[PDB]
């Protein structure tokens with residue numbers, strides 16, 4: 001648990017259109033919707049042996065390579081598989097929320113998905129204090145993964161060069177250098193095929 | 197830790213610093229761990245002393261709740277949230293003074309650390325969110341989004357609250373009043389920068 005420098009793979013996912021969709025229902029409904037979603041994401045992360053760092057509203061942060069050790073290639077394989085399984089889940093969910101009147105039906109479009117994945121060094125371990133301490137990762141690598149998730153287009157998966165080097169060339173749909181805050185050197189990003 | 201999601205009037209506090217990464221770069225790891233911890237330690241103590249609830253940490257950002265899980269009057273929620281925000285800023289200044297005296301800031305010149313805090317009071321679905329496999333206690337809803345947007349909109353080393361919060365704060369303690377259009381929200385919001393001192 002004690003914080004230490006380690007090569008890990010960070011995954012940030014987030015959905016847009018949740019509050020808009022929940023704006024209709026009451027408290028009970030908003031909670032059901034969110035829990036439904038959160039459960040699916042968690043399932044995708046665990047099934048791929050990933051670590052659910054935390055939830056940030058309707059955003060999810062997962063780690064691969066901590067606390068349990070994992071090779072750089074497995075970290076990426078599993079991070080990618082999680083991101084793709086998440087998308088399939090959102091498709092299933094959106095299908096259900098549409099047949100149920102929460103989508104398509106009159107001004108609350110389906111919920112779009114955004115996922116960012118990066119691999120790099122990060123101080124990982126327990127951070128906080130006596131009042132509160134949580135297991136997480138800190139550092140530019142984490143910052144980068146978060147910025148990729150926010151920079152990518154709707155319903156897509158964007159990764160860094162460090163991650164893409166383990167991905168079959170035919171799976172990289174688009175390449176583009178992005179200027180990310182706090183980073184001087186432009187970052188080469190790669191949108192990957194959400195299927196396989 | 198057992199509270200099922202339920203609607204409730206609460207006060208949400210979001211604080212965030214800028215300069216940690218920069219300060220920790222010209223540094224080396226179990227020193228970025230002790231640094232963030234030193235900072236986090238000060239922030240959480242400010243929340244605990246004011247009986248606030250530390251919802252979670254988002255990197256070097258802090259989320260605190262007032263009015264949950266333990267009930268709290270709407271006036272007490274604001275008094276304690278305001279007091280927390282002011283104490284944090286004081287602690288930050290104390291921290292920068294220390295880091296300055298350690299060459300952690302103001303050398304290889306990483307500017308001193310900046311502080312931002314946003315506070316808002318409104319309805320929110322509070323309780324445990326997630327699934328049987330994983331769930332945490334937090335608040336959800338437009339009210340939470342607002343508090344977050346207020347913190348990201350205010351200027352460095354300042355505290356910005358919404359009208360709902362300002363109504364409990366002495367008029368003379370309100371430094372500035374101005375309408376700002378927050379993301380994803382239809383009606384502009386009345387923002388009020390409070391004086392860092394009582």
Ligand SMILES: Nc1ncnc2c1ncn2[C@@H]1O[C@H](COP(=O)(O)CP(=O)(O)OP(=O)(O)O)[C@@H](O)[C@H]1O
Pocket residue numbers: 014015016017018019020055056057058259334335336337340341342344345379380
């Ligand atoms: N329970 C919670 N814990 C931590 N942060 C939270 C939170 N609920 C909301 N937030 C914060 O509130 C803000 C919400 O604004 P956005 O992320 O821009 C909304 P969005 O994702 O674009 O649409 P959406 O809410 O429909 O999904 C974010 O800054 C988020 O981190």
Ligand SMILES: Nc1ncnc2c1ncn2[C@@H]1O[C@H](COP(=O)(O)CP(=O)(O)OP(=O)(O)O)[C@@H](O)[C@H]1O
Pocket residue numbers: 061136137138139142143144146147181182212213214215216217218253254255256
């Ligand atoms: N341990 C962690 N858990 C969750 N989110 C994290 C995190 N570490 C970093 N992040 C995310 O990484 C991103 C960092 O970007 P910013 O918040 O803009 C950095 P900053 O506050 O401007 O400067 P700073 O890092 O020097 O404080 C945010 O989206 C933040 O929420």
Ligand SMILES: [Ca+2]
Pocket residue numbers: 014015016017058059
């Ligand atoms: Ca979102």
Ligand SMILES: [Ca+2]
Pocket residue numbers: 212213214255256257
């Ligand atoms: Ca920050």
